[PDB]
């Protein structure tokens, strides 16, 4: 703690603590060069700028060729991960691909790359194409908007999928040949397990080990993640051999992250918000004089525009010219070409000032435009929601996170910024390629700073949320037919990620059994009981308490196929009726649980009002209710 805070500044509005940049790594190792590779692998790095691998990569690489084993990398994800995955891919290709005969063996190996987001999948795919073009490989996307069919999967070799669509592809019974063919299963951002999509990954993992026992040849599993505690427990979840585990701290990061907080001493929201804006302004003023390109995160998208307006009138009151003093002719040109043409959320004026913003709710084209302009650097300041850290790789020298309380429809309450989101926001930083270090900043209330220091140290385990997704995963598995009884269910649950975590800390995750049942036999079986009661109530699976026999129903099969959540499922069950009509169909569709996170907005409200007058299919609900918004959007 004491080494972390070096220096603290006290200011009238706020008390700011300035953490120094992390330490540079000790060298016990050799930087591994490219000429050490075999013949075909030397084009793995077609542009070899250093001709030597980064501090993280070399050791993990030679270990990766040396062993064929399940591996885990907890790393800054400083662009180091992309190349490592590429290299393991090339190894599998060489194992199925002869060194002498240069014909690539296409039908032997198959590869899967699990990237949480569609956009990041896209980016990855272009990377894999660039690096793998010399072998003559088809690298194509299996997920979502990708829209690959029954055939192209067979044709392709390397796959880049999102977790959801990969889950649904491997869940289906007919394709199992492809699943067996895949030798190489790469999991990017295994730290996702903390978040509620992570349940899908652990379910996929469980299916890989447990579900294919009739062919029974286990594929190579490579986890790739941001640095996280309880790495050992992660390995015990997967298989991981002790040597495959590589834990690298932030000292191995390309640009050391200078951590900074401002505690806010104010309480009432009207002065508190003003104090935050003042602090942000002060930071921006310190940054831009150094020629620093800056990002300011916020909670909500509506917050972005008003924040940028505040920076325009305030920042401009201070000095107008300095933001663009250079190439003002070309800045006027490019700015008018971009802002004036495609933008229509009254965001053009912000672009024109040269403080822009990016958020969900900005047009797809406008969105790409803002990214590009901020890359060129006519945009000095970029106000953003949480989309960028999660999605896009583009780093920016200074990163400010404004505020604590985010509203989550999960609770229906304002919670604190969750650590897993904070960390990935801090990830985008001073550019590893160009700049030397980053500036992280967190605009926050002082009382919660004590919390953010620790959670920002990344001492927090990847929390297992399997409790919510357990039921649906179990149903899908019964549909596969792999579980005929409670004992089978708990054996599958032994390879489940919550199992490990329970073993580590039973009372944290509410194991009553504790001393009893070291293997948590009765705890596992009790969860299965709990699941199969509600499933049976939803007529998803057949179950009997004392006799214990399991079988899958038609509704359960449907939920498995289209990956409907169990809540959505029972909603359909009751709300659909014999006499239900066209009006009620849209209402039920709206009621689908996947829209629970949807809510009506005040900038949306005028267009909603115009719609619902002329809407052909009537709405029983009203403008204030999100369901009505959903089904009118459906009509549109």
């Amino acid at each position: 703690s004491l080494p972390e805070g070096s220096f603290k500044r006290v200011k009238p509005q706020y008390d700011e603590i300035h953490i120094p940049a992390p330490s540079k790594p000790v060298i016990d190792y050799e930087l591994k060069e490219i000429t050490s590779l075999p013949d075909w692998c030397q084009e793995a790095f077609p542009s070899s700028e250093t001709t030597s691998l980064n501090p993280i990569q070399s050791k993990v690489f030679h270990a990766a060729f040396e062993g064929d084993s399940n591996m885990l990398i907890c790393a800054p994800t400083g662009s180091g991960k992309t190349n490592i995955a590429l290299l393991t891919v090339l190894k599998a290709l060489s194992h199925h691909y002869n060194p002498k005969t240069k014909k690539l063996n296409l039908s032997a190996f198959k590869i899967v790359y699990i990237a949480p987001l569609k956009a990041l999948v896209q980016e990855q795919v272009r990377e894999f194409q660039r690096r793998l073009a010399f072998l003559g490989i088809k690298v194509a996307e299996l997920t979502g908007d990708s829209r690959l069919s029954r055939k192209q999967i067979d044709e392709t070799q390397v796959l880049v999928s999102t977790p959801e669509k990969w889950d649904i592809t491997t869940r289906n019974s007919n394709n199992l040949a492809i699943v067996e063919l895949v030798r190489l299963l790469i999991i990017d951002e295994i730290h996702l397990l903390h978040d509620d999509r992570g349940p899908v990954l652990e379910s996929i993992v469980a299916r890989t080990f447990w579900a294919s026992k009739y062919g029974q040849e286990y594929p190579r599993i490579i986890g790739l993640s941001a640095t996280l505690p309880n790495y050992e427990d992660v390995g015990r979840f997967l298989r991981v051999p002790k040597e495959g585990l590589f834990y690298f701290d932030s000292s191995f990061r390309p640009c050391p992250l200078s951590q900074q907080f401002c505690g806010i001493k104010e309480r009432n929201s009207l002065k508190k918000l003003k104090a935050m804006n003042d602090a942000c302004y002060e930071k921006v003023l310190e940054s831009i004089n150094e020629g620093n390109q800056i990002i300011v995160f916020v909670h909500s998208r509506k917050e972005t525009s008003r924040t940028a307006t505040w920076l325009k009138n305030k920042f401009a009151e201070e000095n107008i010219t300095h933001k663009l003093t250079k190439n003002d002719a070309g800045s006027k040109q490019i700015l008018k070409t971009e802002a004036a043409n495609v933008l229509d959320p009254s965001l053009r004026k912000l672009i024109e000032s040269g403080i822009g913003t990016h958020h969900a709710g900005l047009t797809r084209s406008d969105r790409s435009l803002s990214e590009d302009l901020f890359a060129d650097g006519l945009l000095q300041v970029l106000v953003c929601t949480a989309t960028l850290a999660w999605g896009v790789n583009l780093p920016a020298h200074t990163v400010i996170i404004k505020g604590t309380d985010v509203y989550s429809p999960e609770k229906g309450s304002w919670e604190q910024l969750s650590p897993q989101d904070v960390l990935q926001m801090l990830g985008r930083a001073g550019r590893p390629r160009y700049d030397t270090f980053g500036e992280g900043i967190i605009i926050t209330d002082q009382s919660n700073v004590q919390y953010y220091l620790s959670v920002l140290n990344q001492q927090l385990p990847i929390e297992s949320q399997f409790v919510s997704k357990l039921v649906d995963n179990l149903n899908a598995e019964v549909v596969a037919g792999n579980i005929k009884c409670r004992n089978d269910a708990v054996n599958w649950l032994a390879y489940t990620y919550l199992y490990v975590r329970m073993l580590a800390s039973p009372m944290l995750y509410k194991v009553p059994d504790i001393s009893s049942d070291g293997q948590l036999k009765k705890f596992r079986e009790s969860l299965v009981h709990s699941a199969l009661c509600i499933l049976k109530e939803q007529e998803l699976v057949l179950y009997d308490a004392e006799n214990d026999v399991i079988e899958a129903t038609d509704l359960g099969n449907i939920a498995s196929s289209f990956y409907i959540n169990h809540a959505s499922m029972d909603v359909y069950n009751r709300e659909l009726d014999e006499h239900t009509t066209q009006i009620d169909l849209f209402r039920i569709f709206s009621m689908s649980e996947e829209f629970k996170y949807v809510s009506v907005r005040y900038e949306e409200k005028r267009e909603l009002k115009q719609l619902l007058e002329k809407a052909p299919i009537p709405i029983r609900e009203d403008i204030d209710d999100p369901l009505a918004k959903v089904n009118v959007l459906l009509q549109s």
Partner: protein
């Protein structure tokens, strides 16, 4: 500029009802009574405390106040008295302590017990005068006392015993390093005893 802690309202009983500091003005009535009351006694203590800090530290400055040596005064005030009977012990003890706290060069002689004799005190004028007030005024030399003797105490009649000032004045150089009461039985060894300090003439037959 932020360096120091922002102040906070002092809150008294009278003031307690008013304060809109966020803290349990009503909701916790008594727990709020608490923080207030202990707030006051916090301060009040700190007062007494601080006083004791300067008090003690200055007493250490009293040890240092002794550590300097006397800066012997270049010219010496003096006073001389003549008295029939010193026989009352508590007198003598007074004349021991008081002379001693007051840093008084000099002596006291007399003739055996009954013998009248001389009193000499030398030093700064401030102390010498006080010592005089002590001797002449407060202490009553016609006032009889009951003396401890071998078996017990008996009547000793002082109303004959009489004390009077001879004079007071200045002296070139004090030959007295410290003050001692003593006896020399005759007048001669008594006068001679003065004469070792060359003091014979101070006595008046």
């Amino acid at each position: 500029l932020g360096l120091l802690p922002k102040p906070e309202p002092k809150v008294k009983l009278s003031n307690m009802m008013s304060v809109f500091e966020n803290d349990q003005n009503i909701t916790d009535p008594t727990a709020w009574e608490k923080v207030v009351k202990d707030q006051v006694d916090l301060r009040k203590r700190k007062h007494l405390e601080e006083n004791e800090r300067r008090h003690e530290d200055a007493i250490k400055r009293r040890k240092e106040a002794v550590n300097m040596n006397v800066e012997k005064p270049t010219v010496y005030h003096c006073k001389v008295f003549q008295f029939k009977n010193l026989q009352n012990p508590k007198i003598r003890f007074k004349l021991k302590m008081n002379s001693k706290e007051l840093s008084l060069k000099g002596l006291c002689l007399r003739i055996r017990d009954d013998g009248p004799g001389i009193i000499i005190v030398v030093g700064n004028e401030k102390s010498c005068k006080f010592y005089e007030n002590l001797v002449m005024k407060r202490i009553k030399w016609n006032e009889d006392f009951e003396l401890h003797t071998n078996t017990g105490d008996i009547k000793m009649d002082m109303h004959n015993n009489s004390i009077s000032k001879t004079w007071e004045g200045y002296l070139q150089d004090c030959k007295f390093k410290g003050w001692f009461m003593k006896v020399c039985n005759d007048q001669d060894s008594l006068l001679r005893t003065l004469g070792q300090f060359d003091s014979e003439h101070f006595y008046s037959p």
